[model samples]
Target chain A: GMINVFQPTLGEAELAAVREVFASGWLGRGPRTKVFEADFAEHLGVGAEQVVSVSCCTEGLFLSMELLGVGPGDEVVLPSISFVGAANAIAARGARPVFCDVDPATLNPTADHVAEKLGPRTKAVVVLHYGGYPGDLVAIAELCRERGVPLVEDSACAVASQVDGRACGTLGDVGVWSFDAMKILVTGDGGMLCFRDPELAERARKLASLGMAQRWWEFEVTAFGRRSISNDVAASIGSVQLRRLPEFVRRRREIAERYDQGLSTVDGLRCPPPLPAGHTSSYYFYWVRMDASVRDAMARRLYDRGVYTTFRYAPLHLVSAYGHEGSLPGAERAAEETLCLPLHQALSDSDVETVIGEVRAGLAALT
Target chain B: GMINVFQPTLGEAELAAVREVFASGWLGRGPRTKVFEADFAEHLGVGAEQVVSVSCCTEGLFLSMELLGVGPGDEVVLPSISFVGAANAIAARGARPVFCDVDPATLNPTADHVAEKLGPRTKAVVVLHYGGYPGDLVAIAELCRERGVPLVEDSACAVASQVDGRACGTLGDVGVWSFDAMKILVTGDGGMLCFRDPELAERARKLASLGMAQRWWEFEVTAFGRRSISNDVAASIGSVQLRRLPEFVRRRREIAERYDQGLSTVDGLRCPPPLPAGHTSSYYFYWVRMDASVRDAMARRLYDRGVYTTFRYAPLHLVSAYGHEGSLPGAERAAEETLCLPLHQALSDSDVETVIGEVRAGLAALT
Candidate 1:
């Protein structure tokens, strides 16, 4: 049997919560969603009203933009290395996504590139914490402030990580987190939006709740509305996942460190660099770059040896939906070489050792 | 315990299906969602390609309007007695919603009102199947066809319902169904969109998929998109719900009939009239009318006893959101007098008899 590249670590705790939801037969928006939203607020050191839960981060990202009044005739700057959901969010509001090159090593865009792309129409900058690693958040925040552009953080990968002694999602104007099955915290399928300003967060909440400035039973769309609310079934499981997040991330961090020590010795395999001071990764994905020539072959060798590996993402600039038809050299290079290895909380020490040995063997064979 | 107005009858089958999805560890977009979409299509007697599953009927309604090229500078006509989600769907597209009167007896807009309200910029008309009854479907279809206007069916309450021997959703240019927890078929929260043209269905599929018209792995937005896709967790439950819908509706039908017979004899209380030939209701809600002056007192009395009742919707035109200064006499009349009684597979005959006696007693006291 092969160690899969990713898997959610869910068990009796999650099932027990969802079982309660099913038994109660109150599965729509209810106390469960409200409770998780509050729990996430506490985790982020924010007020309960400063969080908005939705069906997925795709909706979260869109609402984050829509509530900010970014739409038609506006331009939003973001990295091409991000998940397609970011680009889709910008597009959803009728705003154009202006793609930029990322920092070659970190796979996140620099403040300089963001400035270079800034124009009269530019309304916002969306920065992703690639692989849960924060990149120049202080510099990026300063640049966005100087330019008077709203900064939206695609912090989908950094729920448990901190930077500058604060959570990754709290540094920007707003942030969104994904709770997809493979996310650091699994909620079946859900997301949360956070904002530094409670008022902004509340505004985004109304946007998510079909633009009804009040509770839905009141029946009003006081603004442009979308019926994008999370259900209690997903939120119930999410509450348990949030409670267990620290444990999940601790094991994942240990796995990443082990991969770090072992993979560093393998020829042609470069371990992702340790974050600079006051920054940490949740280790949602332990990403590595192989020799571009041998990356595919290395993945194949690892698979044959019962250690499955997969490439991370195809940049939006190259995707059919957001085709730039222009060069984004840094993202292109990383996309071609970056590979993800097994890094879930479920893996045993032996499973981790087996994966380490197989990865080394795969690299050695390629060399 | 008091009788609840409406409830979803989800038991062992729903639990088992969700458990399978959990055990399989495939919770996002997967085979389960695809299979449920197919089941909905098959149930509607349409091709699988003709259906699109979304997160909720609100999204379905918005996409139905969006894919039809309804945009700013357009006006869409719909009943004021409808769900606010329908109004938001129209307004979300940067268009205006024109309120029309419903037939007081049916609480659905008539073809005459649809014609009277149609203007040059009127891009579409949204006709809802109030209480799962396909009001004026034949006439509305013909009227829309003559006017070259697209008719969108807000059939959120119409699953398992038929019109002229065909499904209610098929009687229009496009239709949407809600699978929210309280719906006839519970899926936690979800919806389905059915289209008369396969091409329109394909267009809507792209819109729901973050406007990425191609395969998922190849990300790009060919047009404006919303992250409206339904996850497999909800869809897995939906497949079970669809399989069991026939039995659910049969029991609900029997319950509605029992209410029909019991309430028919109550003075000053009117049971809903029988449908024309080849029509059947899924009976998602059982509504009745009473003297507007005494309706509130009647509801309070029923609640004080072991039976409960509630008004279904406050007409949108009267809601602060819609703010229709003009009169919608029929819709206003229906909204004032309408009260939904307890109807679900959960209610026993004894429960039905209790409700009947309570309703009669309440009305007699008012007199």
Candidate 2:
């Protein structure tokens, strides 16, 4: 049996919601989106005024950057080891993306590192909590306060996770979450933008819905906006996923625990760190680090043994598009050594065992 | 029963297709989008390489303008009487919009008038065939060829219409169509971009999918792209609506004919002109022109009598945002005089008669 990294859970509930929408014949950004937003706002424990749903997290990040007026001659600080979408969203605003290296242990940027990269022109600092683990939010928030720059959270991988008894997304001025298929909660392709300030949330919502201060059909020609997810079919799916998120998180934690117990005996392999004190993780991904020199060969060997493994991302600093000419030694080292294993909800006990066996055999082969 | 302007015809077939997508759990831009694109391309008799689906007509127009490199210092000529979306899209590109007056008879921009407004900085001309009646394509194409300006057709109201034995959308460099609930075929909120050039089509597809070139999970951030529609649920609805277009169009034409017969008796009311030679209109909006002085009173009277009547658009030149600084006499005349009555697949013969009775009674009251 093949083990996949991620598999979205679908059933009669989701099917029925979509069928209802189709039957209603009112599909565009109407009642269904409003319902989803309300339910999601409840799930996030924030008022509906602070939550805005969008087509994808990429759009959420991009629009948030635009609303903050991040542009030419400005700089936005982000972790080098995170998804390139965060860096690209900032760079798309014509702002320079300042890369800060991640802590080797947590695979997240420390507040000190992010603070050190801050300069006079720094517009904002975008912090990403890697692999559903909470980052140093308290320190990051303090650093941002000291620097007088806003903090934007790329919480795509950390949905439902908590830091210091507060949600990972709520610690920043603004937070964006992904509802892509591979995300902890699947809405096919969608996102949510949350803001601490009511005005910014309203602005983000209007911007996502094509910058209109009124209904879609009544929009004036002067309103410059972008297309966002408005069809109720996807939002209904998101609503269903939001309801099932607790179950999904529980299952993901179960899988992580099982992998931890089994892989602890493996030599020259390091599992991701545990959740910090008073924190809860949703486990969006389960990454392991191996010897950098033999990482590629080990991954191929695991694949040959019927187990699939892949790299998370190339360092954002090294990617050609961002074109940041600097060495992020920690990010580069992580990129070279990290391999994401199969840790989705669909995995069974035997599937987990097979993965462990393959990793053990692959490492033995590498040696 | 209250008369409504338009409503989508949602049947069991459309419902089942959307239900299947939700059941499949792969709702993102996967197999369903590919299938819808293929079927839509076949319906248009164009190569799959030339057609791509987007979130809405706004996005389709925006992407088309972006792909053509329309920006500051560039001028895009468009009709003063068309929907505000067309001009707004042009302005969103940081370009200047030059409004041309529509032909008094057709309420669409004539090729000669469009050419008269062309200048050295005119990069493109956006043509909207108002109310689905085909514009003067032969003359427009000639003008485009002579001036080295590309034509972008806003065919949101003319999806099933044809001109010169060819689809209305295929006659230009790029054509955009909408599937809003008010259109002949409704998919909630969606649109398609059709291009005559293969490279531009491919480039548009890439840009629509967030500038990602050939990478499965990795995206190349070359430009700012939004997450337009991706979940196959909307596409599935679109595919089903596309299949029922022949029947939908047949009913819409029948309704248009009924309106023409009923309103022909009114002394001062004039229906939209007949389609140009060899053109078959889809009758997206059944419009009638009245004396400008009494139009608003007539509309209010109709509203009082449980019938809905509204103006299609206020001339672009008159809008506060455009700031044309001068009157477009033809556009102003049309905007002031034109009122679109209730027309949709849901309207029965009795509903049509009700509209006719209310309009005549309203006219009598004015006298």
Candidate 3:
């Protein structure tokens, strides 16, 4: 079989959790979901009341925009080298997304980049932990606070990432995490939202459940909420996966280290930058940088050799749908040279060696 | 144990389905979700292209409102005796919800009720199959057609409901179905949307998937869509649940019949009206009517005996949040008198007998 780039490592543990939910016959957004949220909060070093489980990280982004009242005539700043869902959430609220540039090596924006974009109309700043690296978040959070703007951490890739012992997600005003199949923790399709303020988190909980109050039989319509609440079946699997998160991250880190050592002496190729002291990553992505001209051909050759690879985030500034006219040179340059390698909890040693062998040979052939 | 008003009947088959999904390790919105959508479309006798599975029926309602462009200055009419999600969807889009009256016997709005609310600003008319009973759909559809208003059927309670062989959800411009834990089919928390127009259905599918196009490496954004897509884990269980739907409906119908026969001779009480010929129901609910003054006390007594019972909707016209001023007398009267009993696929013969005995004793004691 072809070595896939990302795959979840689900087994008897997850299946057993689902079986328990099935046996209970209480499968709605009930007890199990609460447990998952509580466990996720503990992982983030936050209060249990500060977290809410949602359908996906995308919904969490949208909800964050709504909660912050980032609406028409408002502007939100985010790195162009981020998920399309982040920009879409801003535009969906009739707000403008000011695309900021990221560092070419880390693919994460800096405080200077965000500071340049912050202005009178900027209501919030959204930042992604690119490749699970918590790049410049301490400086960025300080900048957002100095500007009196809310910072939303799109920590979809940083479930285990931290700086100075603080979780990547909990370092901001609002944080969102993804447990999609491709992530370190697989929950089928689910997400968690974290807030520094418990009151906003409770509002999110109500909004996710269609903003209903009191019992189901006699309910009161509260907010114009969407049904983004995750169910127990997914949450039970999430609880199991959360318990296995450290193991998953350890495996992913080991794979990344192998790639780093194997590719260290390769000509005209660069591995991901090392984290600073006291910083950690979940190793959600392990990308390599090469000449922009040879990246596509190299990816094609790797795929032909039964090793799949691709670049993430095509730079939101280039996507015409957002009506962005300016160019972000840093994000554009990073987008062309970055190609993510096979890195996930499921990647075996053999699979990594094969990926390394194919990449070295493919680069030699393409050159 | 206390007999819940609704309980999903899940066992080995569902657990096996979860195991299969877990083994595949491809759990995001992939093959299984497509299969579930096709099967659901077949169940409704509609083209596979006309259906899209969503996060829940509430998402479907919000999507329907978005697809139809029901926005500011537009008026959408629906019965006051309906789920809050239906009204919230309309109001969430900045549209006005005109709470129309429903027939007290069925708790479903009639063609006359909708006609009375239809005006020049009417954008759409929404109707629910209350208690799985399709009331005046033929007349309501005809009235909507005459008024040039799109009819949206909130078929959350009517998965197996039909009139003259046509499914309840398919008999409108747009339809939504719930597979929540409390519904006939359990998918933890999921729903499906049916469209009369295939193009709109395709749009809905795209919108549900974060509006992404092309492959993961290079993509385009088409719309401001949310991540409402159902995962394979939920879809696998849904497929099994759909296969067992017929048997579940048969059990629910049998339970309804028993309740009807047992409570027929009770004084100061009324059973649900007999369905007209060529009409069928999923029997998602079985309610008994009594005097308004004694309803709450009787419900308390029933709860004291462990047979939980309560009314469904509190009438949107009376809810101050909607700012509805006019009186919906029919819905007001129905809300005061109707109390849904324990009716579900999980209800055993003994459970039904116990509920009947408790209701009789509770009513006698309260009076």
Candidate 4:
């Protein structure tokens, strides 16, 4: 089999979980959805009332901002190196996204850069924890609090990672987690939102389900809401996947450790930075920074060796939807150099070693 | 089994379809979704590229409106005696929904009221087929065309329904259908949009997919959009459900025929109008109209005899979100008098007879 760039690695357990839902024959957002929401809440160590499961991380981000009353004539600051979904959500609310620079090493926007972008019209600030490495939450949180602007941690890539004993998604005014197939846990398709304030959390759930103010028995449309709520099928799949997330995270971390050990010997290759004190990462991306000259050629050489590699996030500022005249220098450089190698639990130990070998040989050929 | 107000009647075949997707393991939007869209197009007799499968009907409606550039300062006219979701889509665009009155007999807004309500600011007119019975399309279509306003057929309940040998959805400028557990064709959870104009059809798909103008290979946010795209799991299930729709719709019609035979003679209760010439309904509901005084009491008595019943769509003009002080007398009267009896393919003949018995007894006793 060709070593694919990314895979979810699902099996019989996930299949069985879905079959159970089918057998029940109650597939619309009902009991299965509630149970998964409870499971996610329990896993995040938050009150069940605080977690609202949504269709996807992008929807969750938009709902969070919409609930915060973020809209036209408002500006939201976000990192350019993040997923296009983040800026899409901001622009979705008729709010302009001010693309801020990320620290090149971490590819994460820090408090100082975020502060500079937060103007009088700034209604919210979205801080993305790049590639599961938790960003400077302590500094950013304090800054957002002082400025009286809500903070949204776009923790789509940072699930299972923690800072100062708190989970990555639980520290901000609002936090969003992705459950895409290639994430730390595969939900087939879904997302989760964690809100520090209970009312905001309640608003998010309402915002997602066409803003139905009634308890479903009586149809009521209370807000300008899109029916972006995650369905029972995804909830059922997500429940089982989340239960197995511990091992998924463990294997990914082990693979990252092996890659770090093997790739450190290669000249002109620098692996992603390590986790900070009182923190641990989910290692969603196994990345290396190299010279722009050799990076594209190295990726081409890796493909030829039957070892596929990938690089992503074409930087929101560079994209037309979120384009701005001002430059995001750090995000520009990081997007050009950061390369993400194939990393998944499906890969065996030997597969990791082979990827490491290709990295060394590809670099040697171009160096 | 108790006669549910609604039931999907999914079987092992549906389970097998989902299992195929699971086994393939490439479960995000891919080949399955494309094939299902094509299959739906063939069924509707539209071009394969004209149908867009969306996450849900409400989202499809919203995307259709958004694509029409129907936003703030615009007005979208719709019937008061229809689903809250239809009006919700209008309000979601920050536009006003002028709730038009419906025909008491058919419980559908006629062309006269729709045309009368179409002001200079009116960008669209939403005509909901009250039950599975297709609404007045010929008159409505002519009016919308003359006025230069788009028509969105909220065909959530009228998937297999037809008027004048033409599909209910295809008759309008844009049409949306639901495939929820309770829909005529259950997909577990999803919806589809069909547009008459090719460019408008393409825009609906792009709007649903977070406005990604290009294919999945590139992540570009071309517009401020929502992630309302249907997934592979839903598509796999939807494709199978659609294939089996001919039989499903056939059985539902048989049930409706039995309902008409048993309830038509009952005193103080009249079944819904028969299908128009060259028209066929999917028979999603067995509705009976009575005096408003006995409506709730008859429903209560039916429940007491182990027969489930429902009354829906409290007129949008009375709803707080879309509330306006306007007299939709036709919808007002229908809202009070209309009662929907249990109707699904899952109900046995005996169960249908039992519902008929209870409905007759309840009305006779009240009389």
Candidate 5:
């Protein structure tokens, strides 16, 4: 069997949950979504009222930018090393994304880098916890506080990861987590936004459900919005996935540890580093860094040996839309050399060995 | 069980199809969406290249507006009597929605009404085929061609309805059909856009998938976009429902005939008229007009007696956000008097008789 980069773990329990929803006949956004929100809040250690589930993290980030009232003439700082969804979300709001460098070791934005990009028009700073590793959120959060700007956490890859006993998504005023097929929890395509303020969370919930502040029958469109989630179908899958999260996280962490132990012996590759002081990573992706000149060749060699590899992101600053080529040196460097190996709960010990072997062989060939 | 205005019909077939998607482990928009699009296109007798499935009708309309380049200082004409989603989609683009009056009998915009609202800044005109009944599409299409304006159709309620022996949706530049729980095809919350121009159709597909003109392995921000349809979970459901559409529409039309025959005797109430000339209505909703003075009171009375009645739309011009209180006289009048009685495939003949009897009793009591 081919070792794919990411695959959702499914069983009869998940299938049964969806079957029940189909039998219920109440499909569109309603009770199941409410249940999913409650479970999600419980998982994040927040109030149910503070969690608003959306279609995906992309929508979550875009809606957060809109909620902050960022638009033309406003600038939102983001790490250039982050996913395109992060930058696109800000740009969709008509705000400029001020690219900043990331820490090469962790592939996350540094506080100083973010502060340096801050401008008079800066409304919010979006911090991405790339590959399930939390960013320098503590210092970044403090900086946002001092500057009186809101901090939004793009936690698309870091669901359930925590820092200093607080959740990875709870450090910022608002945090968005993706439940795309490849994420920690798979709901095909969905996301949740965690808000520190109850009122702000309520506003997001209203906005996600097409700006309706009341029940479906009494729904009056007070502002612009879109239909993002359906209760019976997508939320049903989400409910089952939420139940399996503990096991999923444990399996992912085990896979990461195996890769760490196996790859530590390799000479030319650097495995992803541990989370800072008090953080616990969700281990969404197992990333490895190679010499920039040899990374593409190494990835191709691995692919030839039946091990699928991915370069997770192209530094947002280098993308044509942002037009900020070479804007952040560390991020550009990270983007060029970092490659992701197959890491999912479905991987067997033998599959892991095959991946580790291919990497070692690829590196040795380059030498 | 309480009679719902709309309900999704799911059987072993839909259940099995959804189970297949869950088991395939490829939940996001991929092969299934491609298959669904092909099936939808085949159903419409159009080339598969002309169709793109989306998250919901709102997203479908949003993409259409984007393709037309409707933005600030631009205007899109739509009927004031249509659902708020039509107007909201245009407003989300930062463009104004020029509300036109609908013909009283059909509750759809006529060519003259649409032309009156058009100006140099009018980028497009969106027509909603009210209650799955064909609108004055040929006239509107002609007017749009002469004025060099694009005509977009919100065929959410008219998936299989025909105007002048041609499909209702195919008569315009682009047509959007919703598969929300209530429609002829139920996908929980989903929609599809069909267009004659391949370039525009391709653009709509890209915009739906986060503005990527081409697929890439990693996240690369190329253009402003939204997560329209992540995968085929909804589309898979849509595919099953599409196959069942003929039966669904037949049942709906059957209920419409029953309601017409039964409610014709009611005083101060008018059953919606049949399609004009060579048109055929899909009959998504069985709308009736009551005396303007007693409409609300009668509706409330029927509600008290356990029969649900609703206005298909509350008039876009009357909404607080776009409140043009004194404008759109005809739509305002229709908004005051029009009531959509319960009509769905699940309604039995006895149920239809009960609804008609209750409506007559309510009107008589009000008099």
Candidate 6:
């Protein structure tokens, strides 16, 4: 069988959690969801009231835009290398997504890039920890704070990432994490939202459950909200997966190190930059950069040899739907050359070796 | 312990499905979701292309409004007696939810009630098969068709409801069903959307997946969409639950019949009206009506005795968030007197008798 780019590490423990939920007979957003939220909040060093569980990280992005009061006539700055959902959320609120250029090597925007895009109409600044590396986050957050703009951390890939003892998600005004299948932690489909303000986090919880003042009969709608709440089944799995997140992250880091060692000396290819001092990463992605001309051929040849690889985030500025007037040169260049190799807790040492050998062989053929 | 008002009937079959999904190591929106969608379409007697599963029914409501072009300067008429999500969906799209009154007994609007609310600005009509009883669907559908307005059926409680051999949801332009914890078929927190036009269903499917024209690399965003898709874990449970839906409906019907036989002759209390000719119900709810003055006391007394009951959809006109200047008499009246008793596939015969006996004693005390 061909090795896949992303896969979840699910087993008896996840199934056991699911079975317990089924036996409980109350599968909606209930006690288990409450426990998951509390456990995740504790894991992130935040108070229980400062975090809420949502259906997915994308919903958290949408909720962040709403909570920050972004609407028509507002501009939200984000790197062109971010997820499409980030741009969609900004646009869906009638605001503009000001795509910023990222560092070609890190694939994450720097403080200068975000500052260059800031304007009088800028309402929020969103930053994604590209490949779980907190690229220039401290500097960028300092800039947003000085400018009086709220910062949202798209920590979808940084569930276990941190810098100087502060969690990646908690470093901003709002942060969101994904527990989707491809993440270090798997919950089928669910997410967590964290806010610096406890009251705002409470508001997000209500907004997630349809903004009802009270649940069921005699209830009053408090806001124009939709159901974005996670259920107990997913939450139970999340609880179990969270308990194993440290181990998962450790295994991923080990595989990433192996890839770095194996591919470091390859001709015309670049491994990921080393982590900054006092910083940590979830190692959610292990990408290598090569010359744009031979990158596609290398990827195809590797795939043909039973090793799969792909690129993420086809640079929002290049997507016609966003209607950008100019190119983000850094993001555009990275989009062509950066290919994420297989990196997950499920990958064995042999699998990483196979990916390394295939990548080297394919590059030699292309040369 | 309390005889809960709602609970899911889950067992080994559900756990087994979940185990299989965990073993597959692909827990995101993959093969199981497709299988569940096909199975649900078959159950509803529609082509597999006609239905798309969603994260929840409320998302489906939002999608229906968007698909039908209900936006600013448009008015969507719906009965006051509907889930709060329905009103939120219309309002979220920048359209007004013009509340119309319904029949007090059935808590569902008649064709005349819907017609009276229609106007030059009316963009669509929304109806809920209240209590899984398809009241006045044929007439209301005909009225909407004659006026060139699309109808959206909020089939949140009508998974198995039918009219004259046709399903209640298929009677409208778009239909949405809930498989939340309380619904006839449980999937923790999932739903299905059915569109009359196959092409529109395909469009909805794309919208649910964030409007990506293609998957992964070189993908383009075609619409401003969010993540509203289900996962393999939820869908696997849904497939098993759908297979058992007929038995679930049968059990619910039997419980309703018993409630009818037990409560028919009670003084100053009214059982739900008999189903109209040529109609079939999922029997999702079995409610009773009493004098508005004594209803609260009776409910409190029943709660004290360990039998739980509650009302649904506290008349949208009264919810301050909607900002209605007029009262909906039919809906307002039903809200005051109606109380949904303990009803679910999990209830045993003895449990039903206990609810019936407690309800009678509670009423006597109130009298």
**Candidate 3 Cα errors over 4 Å, as ranges:** none
When summed lDDT is taken over every stretch of 10 residues in candidate 5 chain A, the lowest stretch is A212-221
Candidate 5 residue pairs in backbone clash = B28-B231, B29-B230, B29-B231
lDDT, residue B188, model 6 = 89
RMSD of each: 2.7, 2.6, 1.3, 2.2, 2.1, 1.3
Candidate 5 per-residue lDDT, tens place, A93-116, comes to: 878888888888778888999988
Task: Write out the backbone clash pairs for model 1.
Answer: A321-B219, A321-B220, A321-B221, A322-B220
Candidate 4 error regions (>4 Å): A215-220, B214-220
TM accuracy, model 4: 0.95
- Candidate 2 vs candidate 4: which has greater TM-score? 4
Cα lDDT listed for each candidate: 0.82, 0.80, 0.89, 0.81, 0.81, 0.90
The DockQ assigned to candidate 6 is 0.74
Better of 2 and 3 by DockQ: 3
When 1 and 4 are scored with DockQ, the better candidate is: 4
* Tens-digit lDDT string for candidate 3 (B1-367): 7999989988899888888888888887889999999899899999999999898899899999998998999999999987888989999999999999999999988899989998988999999998989989999999998878999999999999999999998988999999988899888888899999999988898888878776258888898788887889889999999999999999999999999899999998999999989999999889889999998888888887888887887788877778746988999999899889999988888899999999888778767
**DockQ of each two-chain model:** 0.48, 0.44, 0.68, 0.51, 0.53, 0.74
Clashing pairs in 6: none
Give, for candidate 4 chain B, the lowest lDDT window spanning 10 residues. Answer: B213-222
lDDT of 6 at A37: 90
Report the CA-based lDDT of candidate 5 relative to the real structure: 0.81
Residue-level lDDT tens digits of model 2 in B1-367 = 4688867787778878866765665666778888888888887779988988887888888888889999989999988876666777788778988998887667787787798789999999888877788878668877997889999988888888887678888887998988876677776667888999989998888788767564123345666565555557668878888889888888888988988888888888898777757898877788888898888888878877899877665577766676554667788788777888887777888998899888888887887
Looking at model 2, residue B178 earns an lDDT score of 89
Candidates sorted by DockQ, best first: 6, 3, 5, 4, 1, 2
lDDT of 4 at A228: 70
TM-score of each: 0.93, 0.93, 0.98, 0.95, 0.96, 0.98
DockQ of 5: 0.53
* Model 5 agreement with the true structure over B278-306: per-residue lDDT tens digits: 87777788888877888778777777777
- Docking tier of model 5: it is medium
Please give the TM-score that candidate 1 achieves against the real structure. 0.93
Per-residue lDDT of candidate 1, residues A65-144 (tens digit)? 87788878999998887777788778777788888888767787888877878899999999888888888777898999
Question: Which of candidates 3 and 5 reaches a greater lDDT?
Answer: 3
